[PDB]
Amino acid sequence: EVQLQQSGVELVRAGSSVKMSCKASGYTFTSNGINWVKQRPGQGLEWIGYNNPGNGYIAYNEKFKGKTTLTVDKSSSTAYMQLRSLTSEDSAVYFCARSEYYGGSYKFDYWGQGTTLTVSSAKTTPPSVYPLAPGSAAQTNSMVTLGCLVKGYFPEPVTVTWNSGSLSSGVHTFPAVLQSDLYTLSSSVTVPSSPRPSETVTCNVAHPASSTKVDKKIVPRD
Amino acid sequence: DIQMTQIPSSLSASLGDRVSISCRASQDINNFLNWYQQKPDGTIKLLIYFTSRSQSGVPSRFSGSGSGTDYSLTISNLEQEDIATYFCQQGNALPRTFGGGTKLEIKRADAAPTVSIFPPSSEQLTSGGASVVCFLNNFYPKDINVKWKIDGSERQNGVLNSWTDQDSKDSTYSMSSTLTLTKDEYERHNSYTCEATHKTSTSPIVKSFNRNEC
């Protein structure tokens, strides 16, 4: 099964350089060219270059030429891309994909998982977790909706669970959004009115990068 | 470069439907056109190569055709595992260029959000912040408009909106909107209102709390 394993440096500061790697396996490395593609989160796909490890060598998209250096190491069977002087426009997901000839042109037939490049100013910060209990005029009358707000963390991801995972129906966890260079997300669980506050409901959030674990029980009032 | 245009950029279809995605190039591409599928959470796969017509080993419901500048991908009976973003790529000249993408979603009966608003938790207020949160849950279509009103006026500053992906079970979306203010500003006002405008009601759906009926 041919396979292409990526990772390079993912969190960097403006002015930095990163060298990413794409390790191929499952086929003779020398026999196929490697291509690198950028996906800037607002979806489109952009071609950066091609590197043939066997048959001589290299092309760059005019745009990426100079900011990018593509090398290979034929003996570890790895392709690399180097980005110099990284700005905000360089934050994206970078994929490497293999070319295969089929009568006339090339198909990019296997692709790596991609490595996210986050150019940032922010440091590892643990989230603040605040329980969100229904307010004032009694609210959510049939089912009750409760939430959890996970406020200033860096980097992604955080994992949010409700009752250590026992409560997994009714839950909505919203994609995090970057506020001033830190992430904020939320999760809601809708429960029967007979469940709370008679039974305990707790949101459990884990932030693997700061080794933080927080348990916040949702209780009446504010 | 050769500019590649996919129409449409979004397509809603019912499960079981025959879907067609089109891709046009700025000059004749000589049939060197490849199509790719990007699943939710980003993996990408080759589906079809050389001018649509050749299948890589994807389901047989994927096929493609075309000549010159205009190519098509068609899925003959839509499955749930097919909602994805699809990309055409021309392989006739350097730079290899890609189409802008077509995203698929499952068309459903309209639903209408269940809205809730949450006052700042006391814990946040001890740190001098006050975020007010509004969950808008399980609605279809995805288009919704949210405005915040404080004692009768502005929405605008400090609001962060986040949307979920379409739910694989039922086929809805959900959204949270969060207004952040400082505790000081929070205590100079009385009502906070989350107002949603969805094409499912002519009257906004409103949720509010007044600060000291708490």
A131 lies in the same domain as A85? no
φ and ψ at residue A209, rounded to 5 degrees: -70, -15
Mark whether A45 and A150 lie in a shared domain: no
Q: Are residues A129 and A172 in the same domain?
A: yes
Q: Rounded to an integer, what distance in angstroms lies between the CA atom of residue A161 and that of residue A145?
A: 15
Q: How far out from the chain centre does Cα B177 lie?
A: 16
Task: Give the residues across from B66 on adjacent strands.
Answer: B71
Which residues have CB under 8 Å from B139's CB, separation 6+? B111, B112, B113, B172, B173, B174, B175, B198, B200
Q: Is B157 exposed, middle or buried (0-12, 13-18, 19+ CB in 10 A)?
A: exposed
Same-domain pairing of A130 and A211: yes
B123, containing H or E segment = helix B122-126
Q: Which of A121, A155, A175 is the last residue of a domain?
A: A121
Number of domains chain A is built from: 2
DSSP per-residue letters across B150-209:
ETT----TTEEEEEPPPPSSS--EEEEEEEEEEHHHHTT--EEEEEEE-TT-SSPEEEEE
Indicate if A5 and A107 belong to the same structural domain: yes
Same domain, A143 and A44: no
Q: Which of A121, A145, A176 is the last residue of a domain?
A: A121
Strands A11-12 and A115-119: parallel
Of A62, A93, A136, the CB nearest to B119: A136
- Residue A115 sits in a domain whose CATH number is 2.60.40.10
Q: Do domains B1-107 and B108-210 have the same CATH topology?
A: yes
Q: Where are the domains of chain B?
A: 1-107, 108-210
Taking the C-alpha atoms of residue B87 and residue B196, their distance in angstroms, rounded to an integer, is 34
Asked if A109 and A135 sit in the same domain, the reply is no
Contacts of A114 in chain B (CB under 8 A): 42
Instruction: Tell if the CB–CB gap between A105 and B121 is shorter than 8 Å.
Output: no
What Å distances lie between residue B90 and A93, A150, B100, CA to CA? 21, 43, 12
b/e for A150-187, b at 16 or more Cβ within 10 A? bbbbbbbebebbbbeeebeeebbbbebeeeeebbbbbb
| Cis previous bond, A134, omega within 30 | no
Per the CB < 8 A criterion, the answer to whether A35 and A41 are in contact is no
Q: What is the CATH code of the structural domain delimited by B1-107?
A: 2.60.40.10
The method of structure determination was X-ray
Say whether both A126 and A54 belong to one domain.
no
CA B158, CA B145: separation in Å to the nearest integer?
Answer: 16
User: Is the CB of A131 less than 8 angstroms away from the CB of B210?
Assistant: no
Q: Could you tell me the residue range of the domain that residue A137 belongs to?
A: 122-221
Which of A85, A105, A121 is a domain's end point? A121
Based on the domain organization, do A110 and A168 belong to the same domain? no
Three-class SS state of B105: strand
Contact yes or no for A130 and B131 at CB 8 A: yes
**Spacing of C-alpha A152 from chain mean position:** 17
How close is the nearest chain B Cα to the Cα of A73, in Å?
24
**Chain B residue with minimum CA distance to A216:** B123
Q: Looking at domain B108-210, which of 3.40.640.10, 2.60.120.650, 2.60.40.10, 3.20.10.10 is its CATH number?
A: 2.60.40.10
Resolution of the deposited coordinates, in angstroms? Answer: 1.9
